[PDB]
Design a protein around this ligand. Sequence first.
Ligand SMILES: *[C@@H]1O[C@H](CO)[C@@H](O[C@@H]2O[C@H](CO)[C@@H](O)[C@H](O)[C@H]2NC(C)=O)[C@H](O)[C@H]1NC(C)=O
Ligand SMILES: *[C@@H]1O[C@H](CO)[C@@H](O[C@@H]2O[C@H](CO)[C@@H](O)[C@H](O)[C@H]2NC(C)=O)[C@H](O)[C@H]1NC(C)=O
Ligand code: NAG
Ligand code: NAG
Ligand code: NAG
Lengths: 41, 112, 112, 132, 132, 132, 125, 125
Amino acid sequence: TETFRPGGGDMRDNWRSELYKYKVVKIEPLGVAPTRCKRRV
Amino acid sequence: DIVMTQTPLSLSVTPGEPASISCRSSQSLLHSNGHTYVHWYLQKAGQSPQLLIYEVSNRASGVPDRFSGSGSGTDFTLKISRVEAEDVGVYYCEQTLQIPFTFGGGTKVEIK
Amino acid sequence: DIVMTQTPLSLSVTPGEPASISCRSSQSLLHSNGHTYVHWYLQKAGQSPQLLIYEVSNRASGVPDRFSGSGSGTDFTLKISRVEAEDVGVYYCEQTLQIPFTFGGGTKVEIK
Amino acid sequence: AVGIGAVFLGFLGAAGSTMGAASMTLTVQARNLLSGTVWGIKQLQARVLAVERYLRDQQLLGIWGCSGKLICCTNVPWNSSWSNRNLSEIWDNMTWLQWDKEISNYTQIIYGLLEESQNQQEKNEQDLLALD
Amino acid sequence: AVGIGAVFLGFLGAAGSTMGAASMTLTVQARNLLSGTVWGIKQLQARVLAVERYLRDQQLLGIWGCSGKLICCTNVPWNSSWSNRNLSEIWDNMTWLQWDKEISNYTQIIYGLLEESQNQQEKNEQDLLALD
Amino acid sequence: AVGIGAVFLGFLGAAGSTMGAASMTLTVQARNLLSGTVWGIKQLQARVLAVERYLRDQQLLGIWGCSGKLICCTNVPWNSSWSNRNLSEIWDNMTWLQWDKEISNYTQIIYGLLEESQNQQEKNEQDLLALD
Amino acid sequence: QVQLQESGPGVVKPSETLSLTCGVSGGTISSSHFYWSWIRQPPGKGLEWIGGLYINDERINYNPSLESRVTISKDTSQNQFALKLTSVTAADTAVYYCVREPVIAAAGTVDVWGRGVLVTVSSAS
Amino acid sequence: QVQLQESGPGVVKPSETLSLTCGVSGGTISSSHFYWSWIRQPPGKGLEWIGGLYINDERINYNPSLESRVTISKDTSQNQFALKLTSVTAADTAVYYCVREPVIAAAGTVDVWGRGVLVTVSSAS
Ligand SMILES: *[C@@H]1O[C@H](CO)[C@@H](O[C@@H]2O[C@H](CO)[C@@H](O)[C@H](O)[C@H]2NC(C)=O)[C@H](O)[C@H]1NC(C)=O
Ligand SMILES: *[C@@H]1O[C@H](CO)[C@@H](O[C@@H]2O[C@H](CO)[C@@H](O)[C@H](O)[C@H]2NC(C)=O)[C@H](O)[C@H]1NC(C)=O
Ligand SMILES: *[C@@H]1O[C@H](CO)[C@@H](O)[C@H](O)[C@H]1NC(C)=O
Ligand SMILES: *[C@@H]1O[C@H](CO)[C@@H](O)[C@H](O)[C@H]1NC(C)=O
Ligand SMILES: *[C@@H]1O[C@H](CO)[C@@H](O)[C@H](O)[C@H]1NC(C)=O
């Protein structure tokens, strides 16, 4: 048997049922890639 | 699916009186690039549909001011100002904002 | 004066086993221009010292992956991955971050 | 008709696509980068962090040869110790997020190389202009 | 003498004048656009609204072909459905406030047209530079 | 080896050196100019004073001919009533702090001269482009 | 001027597949910045989009009511736009419009519309 | 290829001055963006930097343990790099490396190292 029991505890576990779909990323533009062109003078 | 409803069913219009055909989407059709992606088409029975009004409140390269586009989010009205003999046909509302492209049910205008 | 200490004193390495020579400065060696100014040199007895690893975790134009540079501030490790017969000699750690240039005490590697 | 919502994507639209199709539309990630009594200070320190990290990217761009050109060639060669990949793949094989892992050690060497390759090109433009 | 206060006007000086005389001095409205314990937060949210809406106009200007040139030609043609006016009038007949009413529907079509006409011109500059 | 800490100085490194050696490295003072419940408002009014006085120098630079070029020739001649010094000295005799005392009366005459010499050059570029 | 002619069987049997070809005259199907689409319309019952294709990325799209059975391909050997639709039902009685749509005004400001082929499903010859 | 040959007395007396010349073959000493340095090394006791010179600013540097007695000069009349060291002691028994170091990769990516002259101080002939 595995006798499960309810228990509230920390109030954060309520809001983890609402904020599990969302993560927050930081847009980081200004990348760099090699290609075949040179700044002519 | 998004719904394109057309009001009214059929209009018997007099030549000269301003006619109005309205179509309503399921959501607003304004995109961030700056264009409203609501269109209007003319179809004759036994004839392939032709575009009338793209990017509403701006006329195309070949249609006069007899057709007009106005409205706002979720509410679109096509206004036929001056009616000619060639104005008869079935009009269609259609969105090019999202995928798929959904069309109207069809608004027949006939002569009296 | 800043101190460059070298660990260990001398290593008797087998050909093939990864060897490690470590050197520690008195402070961190990261400059604002973007390069880590810690270097490593090879010297044979009776021969002028030659540069191996400049701007660590990047190889030079003529050395293979048998040498490697890694570490962080105040901790620098030179890793000899594959040992050849020509790998013997005395290695030196040296900073080009500040004036003066201070060198290591010398790490002799011999053959078995 | 003309004008459809299929190929006219939105913010982060081509984020899984290849580089040869992501560099087709770079302006859409560009323009949504600045605009879009204690919870007003959560508004202030959210605004002046947005205009600060925008100016920081406009300064690192500015001191190279690229004022606002948004795509620009340069003069530093591509040392193969950085990436060692073929050219013919990395515009239609990989994607940009797969690239950003593949190079992230070698930035601040490229960013340091770009400033010196501009300032050398800057005064040499003046020495050409000074003699005539 | 030389140097008089007659034709050297001030801020918003030519605001009723025609466009051909308002574009003579555009710098005077340009330079007075950034500079000039709870009433310090009325100072903070007045300052970071000034530097924010200045950068927003410098970004919409930036992603077109005009970095800081302040007057610049472009490549999009002028469709007469926008204004339908003659050219020979609107530099000496109208004034700028009369123009801003006459066109305000058709902005965000022009601003959308300008970005695509730059980014098409941007990569085509690269394709010319890439083959040679 | 190659790469030493001797000639690769730091912030304000050549602050006593002559102008011909200070203009060798101008980027090092350039890039450390923006980045680097009441003592958070001492953080806010320290940050929005840094990004404000940076944009003010980028605006006075912007309305001249120098968008981000960081060294640029101009068209106004050098009237000897300003400095009256020889040219052959002031790139290897003086230093920059000795220069800033020697000229500080005559700024805001030069800054006023530079804007008109740009806007005259700006519309004359358009009049050349308009006829063809 | 690209003229689009369409072809296919006018009598299609129940529970078999329907094959429609769209002949591209006066031009090539591989011309850039154009959207090639099939559009059906029952008579007097409104237009319905079947699917589409953009040439520059080879991206085939369909209607989410009809993704399961429609396969759209390009026939470069005959300069044709192809439709294959298996298990055709009574609701597919429609006229098939082959439409080439410019995505940008640099490619074109007015799209073209085909003559349209009316396809009705029956077993009567 | 600039080859650096070094010369000097192999027997230097106590309490006198030591003079070492570094012949510059295959090039000039006044070539730009190079760092000219003297480097000593006792045998099996580690390398030690004596001093240096950058050509473009005429900036002579020394070791802070050894600023007092070393004077470094450039001999343009013979294309030589000069060292003068007075009151030479027993800790100066070392081999003297004349090293030309590019400050930038546009000037060079690998520096050169001299053959090195071993100088030991004694009074025995
Ligand atoms: C996700 O993966 C698919 C599978 O490869 C990619 O589809 C390819 O897209 C390119 C560019 O449009 C075409 O040239 C290929 O013919 C496609 N291959 C296949 C098998 O369909 C797709 O581009 C990837 N990215 C996205 C955003 O869907
Ligand atoms: C401080 O003063 C000294 C003394 O003049 C300057 O040294 C001169 O530097 C220039 C440029 O490097 C050389 O061409 C001269 O030969 C040097 N003269 C002497 C007598 O050494 C020095 O540049 C000044 N500035 C600093 C930062 O030290
Ligand atoms: C970056 O460096 C770390 C150690 O310095 C190494 O483990 C990692 O593999 C490197 N990244 C790549 C992409 O090689
Ligand atoms: C702008 O559009 C509105 C309705 O959309 C119209 O009433 C108005 O006249 C238009 N403005 C001009 C200047 O024509
Ligand atoms: C600047 O002007 C003041 C008085 O107007 C004068 O005393 C001073 O000498 C001037 N500065 C210089 C460098 O001549």
